[PDB]
Amino acid sequence: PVSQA
Amino acid sequence: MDKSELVQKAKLAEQAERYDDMAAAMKAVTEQGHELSNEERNLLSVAYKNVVGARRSSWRVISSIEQKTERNEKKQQMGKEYREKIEAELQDICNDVLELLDKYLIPNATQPESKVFYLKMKGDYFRYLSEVASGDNKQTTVSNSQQAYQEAFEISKKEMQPTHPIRLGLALNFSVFYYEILNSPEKACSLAKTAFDEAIAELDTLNEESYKDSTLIMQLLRDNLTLWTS
Numbered sequence A: 001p002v003s004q005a
Numbered sequence B: 001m002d003k004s005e006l007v008q009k010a011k012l013a014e015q016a017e018r019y020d021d022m023a024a025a026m027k028a029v030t031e032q033g034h035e036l037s038n039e040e041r042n043l044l045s046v047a048y049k050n051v052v053g054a055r056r057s058s059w060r061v062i063s064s065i066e067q068k069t070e071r072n073e074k075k076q077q078m079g080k081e082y083r084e085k086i087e088a089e090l091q092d093i094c095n096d097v098l099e100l101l102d103k104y105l106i107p108n109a110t111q112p113e114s115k116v117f118y119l120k121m122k123g124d125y126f127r128y129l130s131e132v133a134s135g136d137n138k139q140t141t142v143s144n145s146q147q148a149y150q151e152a153f154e155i156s157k158k159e160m161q162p163t164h165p166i167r168l169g170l171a172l173n174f175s176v177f178y179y180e181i182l183n184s185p186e187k188a189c190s191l192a193k194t195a196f197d198e199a200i201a202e203l204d205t206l207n208e209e210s211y212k213d214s215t216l217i218m219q220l221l222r223d224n225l226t227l228w229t230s
């Protein structure tokens, strides 16, 4: 699953 | 040395794709004891995200290899020693960041945006620790992550718009935290859908570039919401 920085 | 120098060296480091340097620099700026600009706050965030992401992928690989049918007890021993070498590294990185969050960044946070941002970061680098934690030390880390995420969340609800990227960001990682760490799809899908529907409810009044970073994050929320429910 993808995410964000 | 001046922040200005460190920040430039950190930007140079980014383009050079040398993130150990980058983080070490952004760390030096944090330790000066002054609140970061939204630029300096995003350099640090990026720096350590890569510094850690390396060990994470390294760790995961050696964990998939150590899964394979290995005969040589030696080859099996070094596999563990190496996975553990990478863990201790993965751990130092997290502690160093969580140290910065606690000592300097979170307490110096002045704006609601910043506070929420650093609290999400705190949650992340506990979630990282919990991936390679063991015994009782695991339960502690898993819990601390949720505290940080949760604290961030109630600030974001009270101080920020549903479409605000930092809040959209928190929603994503926190929903993901539930899914991977606590192995709970319902909560994961629950948090994602809410963060998503609250967003489209007020996504027409915000337009163009405030709406670019927002949609992208809402993209990922939707990508997880589908995969998980199937």
Ligand SMILES: *[C@@H]1O[C@H](CO)[C@@H](O)[C@H](O)[C@H]1NC(C)=O
Pocket (backbone or CB within 6 Å): A001, A002, A003, A004, A005, B049, B124, B173, B176
């Ligand atoms: C990106 O997603 C991965 C997998 O869900 C997660 O491990 C990581 O924490 C995310 N990135 C950030 C900056 O949280």
